[PDB]
Scaffold this active site. Structure first.
Site, PDB file in Angstrom:
ATOM      1  N   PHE A 133      21.662  57.930  60.939  1.00 15.03           N
ATOM      2  CA  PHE A 133      22.021  56.552  61.251  1.00 15.03           C
ATOM      3  C   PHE A 133      20.860  55.640  60.894  1.00 15.03           C
ATOM      4  CE2 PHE A 133      22.414  52.889  64.224  1.00 15.03           C
ATOM      5  CZ  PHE A 133      23.535  52.342  63.634  1.00 15.03           C
ATOM      6  N   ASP A 218      12.451  56.336  59.167  1.00 14.01           N
ATOM      7  CA  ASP A 218      13.099  55.409  60.087  1.00 14.01           C
ATOM      8  C   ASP A 218      12.708  55.842  61.493  1.00 14.01           C
ATOM      9  OD1 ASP A 218      14.821  54.105  61.804  1.00 14.01           O
ATOM     10  OD2 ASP A 218      16.542  54.263  60.447  1.00 14.01           O
ATOM     11  N   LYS A 247      14.359  48.441  67.874  1.00 11.63           N
ATOM     12  CA  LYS A 247      14.710  48.903  69.239  1.00 11.63           C
ATOM     13  C   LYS A 247      13.614  48.560  70.256  1.00 11.63           C
ATOM     14  CE  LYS A 247      18.785  51.779  68.652  1.00 11.63           C
ATOM     15  NZ  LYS A 247      19.074  52.446  67.387  1.00 11.63           N
TER      16      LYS A 247
HETATM   17  O1  LIG Z   1      25.064  49.193  67.128  1.00  8.85           O
HETATM   18  C1  LIG Z   1      26.080  49.917  67.245  1.00  8.85           C
HETATM   19  O2  LIG Z   1      26.581  50.465  66.224  1.00  8.85           O
HETATM   20  C2  LIG Z   1      26.719  50.102  68.617  1.00  8.85           C
HETATM   21  C3  LIG Z   1      27.971  50.689  68.686  1.00  8.85           C
HETATM   22  C4  LIG Z   1      28.589  50.867  69.936  1.00  8.85           C
HETATM   23  C5  LIG Z   1      29.867  51.454  70.007  1.00  8.85           C
HETATM   24  C6  LIG Z   1      30.478  51.624  71.244  1.00  8.85           C
HETATM   25  C7  LIG Z   1      29.841  51.212  72.403  1.00  8.85           C
HETATM   26  C8  LIG Z   1      28.585  50.622  72.328  1.00  8.85           C
HETATM   27  C9  LIG Z   1      27.954  50.456  71.082  1.00  8.85           C
HETATM   28  C10 LIG Z   1      26.685  49.860  71.021  1.00  8.85           C
HETATM   29  C11 LIG Z   1      26.074  49.687  69.788  1.00  8.85           C
HETATM   30  O3  LIG Z   1      24.811  49.088  69.753  1.00  8.85           O
END
Ligand SMILES: O=C(O)c1cc2ccccc2cc1O
Ligand SMILES: O=C(O)c1cc2ccccc2cc1O
Lengths: 391, 391
Positions: A133, A218, A247
């Site tokens: 990712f 990363d 992050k």
């Molecule tokens: O950044 C993301 O791809 C991300 C996807 C999610 C997908 C489902 C629930 C929370 C989530 C929080 C995220 O930061």
């Protein structure tokens, strides 16, 4: 109430996240409280972001002081916090060659900067790992190795080849003299805290150096001292050409960075890249505070000690649902013998713990580095009942 | 000192911006002070970001209050500020169909979200304007209409066709039944505050509607009430399918948004997009404060009134170097009869004013909406000497 907040969410938010199951009202340290008064011990840190937890006084002080001094200016003007932060990050990387810094707002943006760096090598072929990712913007999504997240958005920018993570022969075969860069997480986070075999990162460094490819590490999730070294790749004694961070870098405030070493640091010339908010004084001041606290409180070394004890405690349970524990420091994955991770996320929530079902069979932990050992110990003691109830 | 700060910049920063000519130490309202103690009236706002200037008490209060309540959580959890901000932004757009919101960190990321939305229409062809600016990440850079900035990073995500801005028949010829979306700035900012002919955005709305393409309006620079309506496209009586915002949205704190109307609001389903920091409570709280102040202090109407007076004042100078003034509200371009904008940027700085040479022959202004009338009056009176010195 939680129901009222979720209904408001569903009336206005896009559904790209689904509907959150809990609505948080307040947080302090590693404990958050929902709008119904329920407390939770945060073992996820908002997905490895809240390195210092909530309401950390050093971050609050830094942000308040900087907002009362000088806010956003854009990079038309030089400002102290971003310069000082760049200096501190370069010192932490400890490369032998000159290192230069580009600031942005997110992990995806940091990897977009690295993607653009790779284009300036004159090569267009890129290599990443299956299940990696690297972000959700069009360039970083091409590097992400998750077809479910990618295929609805095809075509993505090229030319990316994905190989099995940790497979030295597969990496050696994919990298040649047309390869601009290899992107790797030192531990794959989103995939389920997948740790590569011993020697893999060193092989990647040798393979890339031999073929003239950039090695881009990363560290968006593995950095900020989480694994017991500031950058996780420092455990393996290598220096990549490019490192990306986000992050936890701002302890919660949005900030990301791309660091480039040696010739790669000179690829970007005036006018070729930018980000309006990049390096702004308020977010850079927050990140400077985070680095200061990590250093003054010894939190990087502490993360190694707490994580080792945490891993041993989980392993010492002998629970039949646990296949093994993996990770390093305070990035940990509990690999299960059956795909009950989502159910275990729910039963952990009932018991007052925030964890993440990173894969159908992997529970991911990324607690604040300020978490107390007692809070980790309490989770370990609660874990058998959490797992029994999940199945 | 400026020399020491610039030397520190040159030792650690990547060179993608060049080296800033001045180093800023503090700011308050529309006045910034460099490290040597010199003050400047900020007519650029950090490139349209500081809609309420520096140290605005409402933004400071909102950020300090939220940091002492609940920081970043990620969108695994519902939190009040982002939900409330989405509700307020939907109200301000005032579309007749349901509108949904996705938060991110930047204008590039907002347009990346819109780019990915357009993929979900089943079409891959996109149309944008020559000289348009939509961001620097790989997807947004493909939309940006600047070959000098795109060529080094080719190949970019496809399939984008660029047409002359404001040309109705050129747009009609390029948009067909295979076009996913058209992206347009209501006024092209980076290119030099280029205003389209009357009716052009309405024509784009009609062309896209008849061909089944989305109309995406990039309000990153024209939004936030700067032109005398909250969204600049509201002057033209149209509702696009997607609107992007950033820059001034958070009064300086990094935040962007993608709003989608009607069927476009339902395209993103769970797991298909995200941004770790998106919608975080601290930046959303800042944005909410900006909206509160715009409304309470009548700053949107003030931008129109002061913009008219400012345009009239500059034109009243009868200076031979000034061809015309264009724009709306407090987004203004001073178009010159000869290419001295970059020199005028430096001589304006000598006279104590921050402006932008957006093109060789265009000076761009985007002052804080809280700028004093007298600060504008002093600029207009100083402008003849600024231009004379530039030549
Ligand atoms: O950044 C993301 O791809 C991300 C996807 C999610 C997908 C489902 C629930 C929370 C989530 C929080 C995220 O930061
Ligand atoms: O975002 C940008 O592309 C950008 C480019 C610059 C290029 C030269 C100087 C300052 C600049 C500031 C920016 O935010």
């Amino acid at each position: 109430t939680t129901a009222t907040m979720r209904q408001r969410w569903q009336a206005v938010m896009m559904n790209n996240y689904g509907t959150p199951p809990i609505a948080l009202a307040s947080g302090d340290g590693a404990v958050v409280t929902d709008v119904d008064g329920r407390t939770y011990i945060d073992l996820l840190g908002g997905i490895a972001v809240n390195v210092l937890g909530h309401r950390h006084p050093a971050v609050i002080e830094a942000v308040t002081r900087q907002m009362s001094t000088l806010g956003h200016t854009s990079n038309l003007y030089a400002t102290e916090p971003g310069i000082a932060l760049a200096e501190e990050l370069v010192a932490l990387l400890g490369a032998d060659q000159r290192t230069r810094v580009f600031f942005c707002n997110s992990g995806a943006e940091a990897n977009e900067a690295a993607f653009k760096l790779s284009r300036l090598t004159g090569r267009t072929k890129l290599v990443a790992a299956h299940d990696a990712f690297h972000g959700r913007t069009m360039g970083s999504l091409a590097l992400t190795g998750q077809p479910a997240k990618q295929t609805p958005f095809a075509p993505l920018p090229g030319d990316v080849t994905h190989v099995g993570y940790g497979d030295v022969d597969a990496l050696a075969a994919a990298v040649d003299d047309h390869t601009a860069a290899v992107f790797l997480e030192p531990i794959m986070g989103e995939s389920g805290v997948v740790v590569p075999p011993a020697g893999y990162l060193a092989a990647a460094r040798d393979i890339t150096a031999r073929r003239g490819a950039l090695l881009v590490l990363d560290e968006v999730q593995t950095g900020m001292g989480r694994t017991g070294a500031f950058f996780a790749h420092q455990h393996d004694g290598i220096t990549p050409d490019v490192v990306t961070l986000a992050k936890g870098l701002g302890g919660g405030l949005p900030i990301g960075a791309c660091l480039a070493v040696g010739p790669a640091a000179e690829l970007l010339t005036p006018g070729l890249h930018g980000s309006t908010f990049g390096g702004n004084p308020v977010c850079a001041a927050a990140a400077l505070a985070v680095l200061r606290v990590l250093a003054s409180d010894g939190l990087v070394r502490r993360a190694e000690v707490l994580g080792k004890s945490l891993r041993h405690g989980i392993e010492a349970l002998g629970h039949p649902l646990i296949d093994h524990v993996r990770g390093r420091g305070l990035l940990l994955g509990i690999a299960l013998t059956a795909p009950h991770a989502k159910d275990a996320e729910a039963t952990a929530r009932d018991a007052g713990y925030l964890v993440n079902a990173a894969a159908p069979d992997v529970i991911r932990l990324a607690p604040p580095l300020i978490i107390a050992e007692a809070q980790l110990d309490g989770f370990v003691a609660a874990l058998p009942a959490i797992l029994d109830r999940a199945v």
